[PDB]
Structure formats: structure tokens, C-alpha cells
Ligand SMILES: CC1(C)CC(N)CC(C)(C)N1[O-]
């Protein structure tokens with residue numbers, strides 16, 4: 295297991311523009327295109343992201359290229375953020391993947407808003423952190439994914455992904 299595998303499971307793979315769990319146009323492995331309700335705007339974002347005029351459909355290789363860029367962008371967002379970087383630095387590699395997963399789903403600003411959870415993670419109070427992370431819109435809106443990510447923080451293992 296690694297972060298690419300983890301997010302590939304959590305996000306799936308779709309080669310045509312679709313709507314994500316919040317209703318936003320997305321493609322590939324969870325690549326958010328826009329929050330605009332305009333499909334034309336989303337298609338323009340896709341063309342710009344891929345570098346060619348698309349019909350709203352990309353190849354698997356193109357989806358994986360965007361995905362690697364997006365994982366990198368999630369790590370960059372963590373490392374440039376004064377609240378996320380010290381937490382990330384304090385974590386083992388499995389729990390680092392859990393934090394990257396959250397930032398991939400919600401963005402740097404959103405995850406940096408988990409102030410009290412971040413402090414508990416840095417303190418390595420894993421069960422207390424797990425409870426606090428569940429008191430969130432995130433957990434209520436995507437509970438199965440949040441449970442997998444929280445189990446990863448709680449245990450430092452890939453147990454929540456093993457049978458998947
Ligand atoms: C690519 C795929 C099918 C995604 C799953 N979410 C996890 C792993 C184990 C990596 N595999 O193989």
C-alpha cells in the first residue's frame with residue numbers, strides 16, 4: 295500500500311466528466327475541475343489541464359498524469375502551510391498518507407481548519423484524534439471514506455484498505 299493506491303481506491307477512475315460527492319464536475323481519479331455548475335466551464339478547465347481540445351473524455355494515461363500532479367500538489371499544500379507542515383513532519387509514512395488523502399479531498403485550507411485534530415495528531419493521541427476527526431462535516435458527508443482515513447490515523451496501519 296501507498297498514497298497512490300489509497301487514493302485510487304477512495305476516488306475511483308472515470309474517463310468522462312462526472313460529478314463528485316459534492317456535485318462538482320470532476321474527471322479521472324478525483325480531479326476536481328470546477329465548482330461552477332456550467333458543464334462548458336468544466337470542459338474548458340479539462341482542456342486547459344490536459345493541454346488539448348477534449349470531448350470531455352480522457353485516456354487512462356492522461357488520468358494518471360493528472361493524478362500524479364494532484365498528489366504532488368497535495369504534498370506541496372501541506373508543506374507550505376504553517377499548521378499542516380509540523381503535523382506532517384511529526385507523522386510516520388502511513389499516517390502521512392492519511393493527511394495527504396484529506397488534503398486531496400478537501401484542500402489545504404480546509405484541512406488546516408482542523409486545528410484541534412491537528413494538535414492531537416501531533417501529540418500522537420491517536421484515539422482522541424480519531425474521535426475529534428469524526429466530529430466534522432467531512433465524517434458526516436463521506437463517512438465510509440472518513441472512517442478509512444481515520445482508522446489509518448488511529449492505527450498507523452493499512453488495515454482499513456487491506457480487503458479492498
Ligand atoms: C489500484 C487499486 C485497485 C485501488 C485500491 N483502492 C487499492 C489498491 C490495493 C492499490 N489497488 O490495487
Ligand SMILES: CC1(C)CC(N)CC(C)(C)N1[O-]
Pocket residue numbers: 421422424425426
Ligand atoms: C477518549 C476516546 C478514546 C476518544 C474516542 N474517540 C471517543 C471516546 C469513546 C470518548 N474515547 O474513548
